[PDB]
Paper text:
Typhoid toxin is an A2B5 protein toxin and an important virulence factor for the human-adapted bacterial pathogen [name] serovar Typhi, the causative agent of typhoid fever. Typhoid toxin contains two enzymatic subunits, PltA and CdtB, which dock onto a pentameric delivery platform composed of the protein PltB. It was recently reported that the same enzymatic subunits can assemble with a different delivery platform composed of the protein [name], forming a distinct version of typhoid toxin. Here, we determined atomic-level structures of the pentameric [name] subunit, the fully assembled [name] typhoid toxin, and the [name] pentamers in complex with glycan receptors.
The ligand-bound atomic structures of [name] show an additional glycan binding site not found in PltB and glycan array analysis indicates that PltB and [name] exhibit significant differences in glycan binding specificity. In contrast, we observed that [name] binds both Neu5Ac- and [name]-terminated glycans and did not demonstrate a clear preference between the two sialic acids. Strikingly, however, [name] showed much greater affinity for the [name] glycan than its Neu5Ac-terminated counterpart, whereas the binding of PltB to the [name] derivative was almost undetectable. As has been observed previously for PltB and ArtB, the structures of the apo and the glycan-bound forms of [name] are overall quite similar, indicating that glycan binding does not trigger large-scale conformational changes. Both structures reveal that each [name] monomer displays the canonical lateral side glycan-binding site observed in other homologous B subunits, including PltB. However, Tyr103 from [name], which is absent in PltB, forms a direct hydrogen bond with the extra hydroxyl group of [name] and provides a structural basis for [name] to bind both Neu5Ac- and [name]-terminated glycans. Importantly, in addition to the lateral site, each [name] monomer has a second glycan-binding site located at the basal side of the protein (opposite from the face that interacts with PltA), which is formed by an additional spoon-like structure that is absent from PltB but which has also been observed in ArtB. The most critical residue within the second binding site is Ser45, which makes multiple contacts with both glycans and also stabilizes the extra hydroxyl group of the [name]-terminated glycan. Binding to different glycan receptors does not result in marked conformational changes in [name]. In accordance with the results above, we found that the S31A mutant exhibited binding affinities similar to that of wild-type [name], whereas the binding affinities of the S45A mutant were drastically reduced and similar to those of the S31A/S45A double mutant. Together, these results indicate that [name]’s glycan binding specificity is largely mediated by a second glycan binding site not found in PltB, which is likely a key determinant of the different trafficking and cell targeting properties observed for the two typhoid toxins.
Numbering used by the authors:
A (entry chain B), B (entry chain A): 22 to 139
C (entry chain E): 22 to 141
D (entry chain D): 22 to 140
E (entry chain C): 22 to 145
Amino acid sequence: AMADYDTYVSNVQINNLSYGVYTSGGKETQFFCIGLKHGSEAISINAMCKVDVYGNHKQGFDNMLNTAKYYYTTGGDVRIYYKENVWRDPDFKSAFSSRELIAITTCSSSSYCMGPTV
Amino acid sequence: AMADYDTYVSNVQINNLSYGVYTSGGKETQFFCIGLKHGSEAISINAMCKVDVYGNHKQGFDNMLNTAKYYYTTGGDVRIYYKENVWRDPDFKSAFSSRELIAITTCSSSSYCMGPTV
Amino acid sequence: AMADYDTYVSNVQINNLSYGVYTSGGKETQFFCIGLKHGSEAISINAMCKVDVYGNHKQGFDNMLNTAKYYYTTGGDVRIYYKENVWRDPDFKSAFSSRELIAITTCSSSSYCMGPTVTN
Amino acid sequence: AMADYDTYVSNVQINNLSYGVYTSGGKETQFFCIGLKHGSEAISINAMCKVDVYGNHKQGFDNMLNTAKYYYTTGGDVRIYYKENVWRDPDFKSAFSSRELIAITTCSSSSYCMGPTVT
Amino acid sequence: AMADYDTYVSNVQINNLSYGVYTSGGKETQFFCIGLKHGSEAISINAMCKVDVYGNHKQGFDNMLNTAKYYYTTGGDVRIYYKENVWRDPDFKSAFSSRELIAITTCSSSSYCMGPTVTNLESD
Ligand SMILES: O=C(CO)N[C@H]1[C@H]([C@H](O)[C@H](O)CO)O[C@@](O[C@H]2[C@@H](O)[C@@H](CO)O[C@@H](O[C@H]3[C@H](O)[C@@H](O)[C@@H](O)O[C@@H]3CO)[C@@H]2O)(C(=O)O)C[C@@H]1O
Ligand SMILES: O=C(CO)N[C@H]1[C@H]([C@H](O)[C@H](O)CO)O[C@@](O[C@H]2[C@@H](O)[C@@H](CO)O[C@@H](O[C@H]3[C@H](O)[C@@H](O)[C@@H](O)O[C@@H]3CO)[C@@H]2O)(C(=O)O)C[C@@H]1O
Ligand SMILES: O=C(CO)N[C@H]1[C@H]([C@H](O)[C@H](O)CO)O[C@@](O)(C(=O)O)C[C@@H]1O
Ligand SMILES: O=C(CO)N[C@H]1[C@H]([C@H](O)[C@H](O)CO)O[C@@](O)(C(=O)O)C[C@@H]1O
């Protein structure tokens, strides 16, 4: 199976964004975080972030930000692939999330979104 | 004829998108994939991907991604040029596709799309 | 708490935007500034800027600019994190403010915007 | 006159777009090409292209691509400046065009588009 | 005052746009130019341009271009800051403009635009 693709939430919408600059662990960073909803259904797995110079995958900062902004605009249904327990700066984790954003795929129906499933 | 332009599907719409980050073969990659339909019906040649650091043509990652996102937004009729049997990571090809995305051109009628045909 | 995240204004709208190029302190700069409203409420904390080659955080100029431009388009409610007393160029500070823009987050309700809320 | 601004078509609309990656003449390239509307015909005429690593002007690939995509989206009237007899890869010329895209300007009326004119 | 911010036109709309490539002085350049109107009126100062590798401020080509395109799309009211007598190739000036685009700011009402204004009637 694809490494780091085992943990996802499907058929969600990106209903909030954050983008900022921040000194973390003595380094200058950019970060963004997405906030999720699932229609009217309460979702607790509701925030995932990406940092330009930290994380399991530093690549794709701008492209992932632009992709997240796109789905915030459309309100379309997506699947979010993420990794738990990544961010080690405790101030950041408490403010935003511990989760790293890995991938965003679209859902064309209540069952199907692109990408691997477990 | 133009090398790598002999294999295409016409009058399709990009009805799904994936963008992600992924370690493949020891390298840190970005990828995106496009999902297709043929008007009202499915097409089983229905996914094609591009990878920033692997493939026959590594250039144009951002421009191809932006172009794919554009036609996902418009739902316009397009022709997709692609190359067979490119992606060799078995987990990636199982989840997404073996095909490398080469070009996207528009169709201005049910019988005409820009670019070369066989 | 997150350094430089203790000062913010919530549930505002970006109702004006400036982008330009400018020589400041002997250096060629780009800058942008956002202007804020909060409905019809009188606000005084109403402008914040980012400069490509000066500031506490020089990274993220383009991304912050495009983010600011997006919310100017939507008119949606946002929270603005900023830092006081950054820009020293007297002409620039007089035209805009001294404040450096640190982050922009969205507000999905009257009571929620993303990001930390703890203060000093 | 401005060099490479002598040849143009005015008050046209872009009705097709192509973007791809392609090996030409031993080099990896990106290209895009625009097609122009002719009456109610589906088939475009007067296609023009730009290539990232070849041409008289290699700069501005991404900006020109995004400009062309913009006017394809709006369908607005534009003036297109181009150069004839540029692309020499026979396969590319046959599939797309020999013309290199130089500039795109808007037309605010049937009688005015920005940029220089020739008589 | 802010250097290069003393000449501007306020409450205009960007109603035309040009982008192109051009060889000048042995350098390959990009440029763009904006055309302006003041509501239903034509104005005197109605065009200004930016060039990626010439001018008083070479930085910010892409960000200025994107910003100009945005306001051409929205048709919103803006203030344009510009500098006179920058482009001194007469065939470019005849074709497009002699003025260099310095900044674009918004006008949220007919009475307010963001950005510096001159000190007084004589710009002392
Ligand atoms: O074989 C390949 C491998 O690259 N490409 C050909 C491609 C594929 O065989 C199909 O897309 C697979 O479903 O088919 C091409 O020709 C198509 C195309 O012209 C489409 C346009 O809508 O029509 C397909 O014909 C339809 C037909 O019009 C329908 O009436 C009905 O008969 O079903 C067929 C199948 O959909 C043509 O087959 C293509 O360009 O997509 C040629 C490619 O060389
Ligand atoms: O205001 C602008 C807008 O572009 N630019 C000015 C720039 C910024 O205000 C700062 O870089 C933001 O952090 O400040 C310039 O001036 C500086 C510079 O002269 C340095 C020299 O070391 O001093 C900075 O002032 C120091 C001060 O001397 C110390 O006492 C210190 O502890 O406080 C300040 C910084 O807070 C001056 O601000 C610059 O060149 O960087 C001028 C720019 O025009
Ligand atoms: O399939 C993918 C997707 O990124 N990448 C594979 C990659 C591509 O399939 C190949 O490079 C494309 O030509 O092949 C590898 O053998 C390699 O070049 O190291 C392994 C790598 O995992
Ligand atoms: O036609 C194309 C399309 O990229 N490129 C050709 C390229 C262009 O036509 C030429 O560079 C345009 O000025 O000419 C070549 O002779 C070359 O410069 O090596 C061959 C190359 O295949």
